[PDB]
Design a protein around this ligand. Structure first.
Ligand SMILES: N[C@@H](Cc1c[nH]c2ccccc12)C(=O)O
Ligand SMILES: N[C@@H](Cc1c[nH]c2ccccc12)C(=O)O
Ligand code: NA
Ligand code: NA
Lengths: 387, 383
């Protein structure tokens, strides 16, 4: 339940029963031969795993530093790493005899992934989404509707991601017997941070095998963007015991760390409790304060407790990249490698480019390209302008 | 050169020189050890081949007849099969010493694939696109520019795909010494129909191996959508010599075959010469306009190798309306969690009707040629 001082089950007593049932089911099914057969089958044939590890040769040469590989989570079904978690939890839900899935979403990407997994497995899907995010993400709302999911606008509180999570928790207490609450990052009360990390760790396991095959050795650095932290945990976790491999999580620097408009919880937040977990949050008064990022998936005031832990024990380092830096990396990757990255993933690219220039040419960097940029074209069109 | 009577190389003297140079280069490089090491490496690490073969279990059980499998070309980098052709030809261009790629596009999808491949190999990319299509494909135009390509609006003639092809050809005769013309389907003069089919046949070879692993046998029917015909040939070509395997191409029925608003060249068109080849074209007489809700299927002509297959009766060709493809778009999204391209939805729509007639022991493979992210704006307006 804890990662050092972070994690826990900071929830009302009505949630402890449901969380214990989930913890017991997961402990049984995680190593069950039939569950993993079906999971791997769906990941292979429906999601398209494994994804490749791609040597960004032009980008490497242009910077003239370390070798930059991209783990291509942009190629999984739906365009983001979120699918790995959505399938895992939706299948777990089916094996527990649940008929309905609920989920929070802010950017809409998790909402879409949950709706896809729900469609696949013949399950009912309701997505809680803050009204401000509904307005901002008209196309993802439409994807969810096409996929057969029902989107429920959340009008309470700040009308955004944190409020959707709380409304989803309120639903789950009343409906847990037939409903699984499908959380979209390594956040929330135990066992969710563990379950989501476990279902994303396939990224790192593939990456480790692919890099040893491609280069005969472990990478020097692994770089991943961090919103809540699931894609980073997925690629990090199989290298945690490899002491030589530096892990770098990249948070949303927004308009700048001193601008007050960012989502860098580990960098500038404080220890706090929200959504069932003890972790780092941006807060003023005790009030969990609004976050910002040009990348909608990084727009969350908190962070997963396992990242707080890895930062505390200094196993991983955490940095911030601004909106402008990510936007330059989005354009740069597109025209240098013909890969349009997600704006979230562009933060990790942006940092990797700075980091490669310093490092030696014999050394190796893996960047987790967590998603594709199709979803972000409207945004980039507005902000970068038509060209 | 030819496929039965169809195909050929009916171009002026200014095109004979570059086309012959391309045939020699293609002969040289198609089986070269170094060329294939680079191609398979790019298809694996950058494009993400192989793509899976998916058993659509809920769709199959719902319909209650044949097992429907989907060849998941929607998962290739870029979201459509065209990437296969774009990499192969762009690589060929690099091996021939070319620094520039030109290409036609109407839907924008070949334009994006060529832009991506050009970015990948460090080549200049100019995309010829009709002004009517430039106006209807804002986001694909943005994608191309984002990928470092330039988009040259074509204002001659009907301001769409056929005219853009013509302008690229006029460019290529002037610039062939350093430019490769990257054609986007199995059309145009020899050797383009052969080259494009060869670069897409990876689809069919994977699908064959995959269905043998899953089911222990070849499929009873393969169903693919047909615009120019590159995704259909890709999946058809490895099964041509397997006599038991039925091949079904699905053209755009549009507003209806009786309506005059469709792109079913094989079904309702006449034989003629255009863009240096003998094939089927919709005719008024002269070549007339085409229409489909799926922009990728919106072309009045069709590949000569499909004309050949239709004649020998090796492959059967059918049409599916806008309405029918739309219903299949929604059905596959809701039932399987896969949002198909509207082009691909034509293939799904026909495979669904066909599955109903067939038995539960029998197998259909549908080429799911692309994903539907690009079509959401169009589907939103109709919805
Ligand atoms: N906001 C993103 C990612 C996300 C989902 N759930 C979260 C919980 C915490 C942090 C981030 C997330 C999305 O909905 O796609
Ligand atoms: N119109 C589609 C497909 C296409 C490209 N070139 C073609 C030539 C003939 C027929 C169709 C095509 C596109 O541009 O993406
Ligand atoms: Na955060
Ligand atoms: Na046609």
């Amino acid at each position: 339940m804890w990662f050092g001082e972070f994690g826990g089950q900071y929830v009302p007593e009505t949630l402890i029963g449901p969380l214990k049932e989930l913890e017991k089911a997961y402990k049984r099914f995680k190593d069950d031969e039939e569950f993993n057969r079906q999971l791997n089958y769906y990941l292979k044939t429906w999601a398209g795993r494994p994804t490749p590890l791609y040597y960004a040769k032009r980008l490497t040469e242009k910077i003239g530093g370390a070798k930059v590989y991209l783990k291509r989570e942009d190629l999984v079904h739906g365009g983001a790493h979120k699918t790995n978690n959505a399938i895992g939890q939706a299948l777990l839900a089916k094996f527990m005899g649940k008929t309905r899935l609920i989920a929070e979403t802010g950017a809409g990407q998790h909402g879409v992934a949950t709706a896809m997994a729900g469609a696949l497995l013949g399950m009912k899907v309701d997505i809680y989404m803050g009204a401000e995010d509904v307005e901002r993400q008209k196309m993802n709302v439409f994807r969810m509707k096409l996929l057969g999911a029902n989107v429920i606008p959340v009008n309470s509180g700040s009308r955004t991601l944190k409020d959707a999570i709380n409304e989803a928790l309120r639903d789950w207490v009343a409906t847990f017997e037939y409903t699984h609450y499908l959380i979209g990052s390594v956040v929330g009360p135990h066992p969710y941070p563990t379950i989501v990390r476990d279902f994303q760790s396939v990224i790192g396991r593939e990456a480790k095998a692919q890099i040893l095959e491609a280069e005969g050795q472990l990478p020097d650095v692994i770089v991943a963007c961090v919103g809540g932290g699931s894609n980073a945990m997925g690629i990090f976790y199989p290298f945690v015991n490899d002491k030589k491999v530096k892990l770098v999580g990249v948070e949303a620097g927004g308009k700048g760390l001193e601008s007050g408009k960012h989502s860098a919880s580990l960098n500038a937040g404080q220890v706090g409790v929200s959504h069932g977990m003890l972790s780092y949050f941006l807060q003023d008064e005790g009030q969990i304060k609004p976050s910002h990022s040009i990348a909608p998936g990084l727009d969350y005031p908190g962070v997963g407790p396992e990242h707080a832990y890895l930062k505390k024990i200094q196993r991983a380092e955490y940095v911030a990249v601004t909106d402008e830096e990510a936007l330059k990396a989005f354009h740069e990757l597109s025209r240098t490698e013909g890969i349009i990255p997600a704006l979230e993933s562009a933060h990790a690219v942006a940092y990797a480019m700075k980091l490669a220039k310093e490092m030696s040419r014999d050394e190796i960097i893996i960047v987790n390209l967590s998603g594709r940029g199709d979803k972000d074209l409207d945004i980039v069109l507005k902000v970068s302008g038509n060209v």
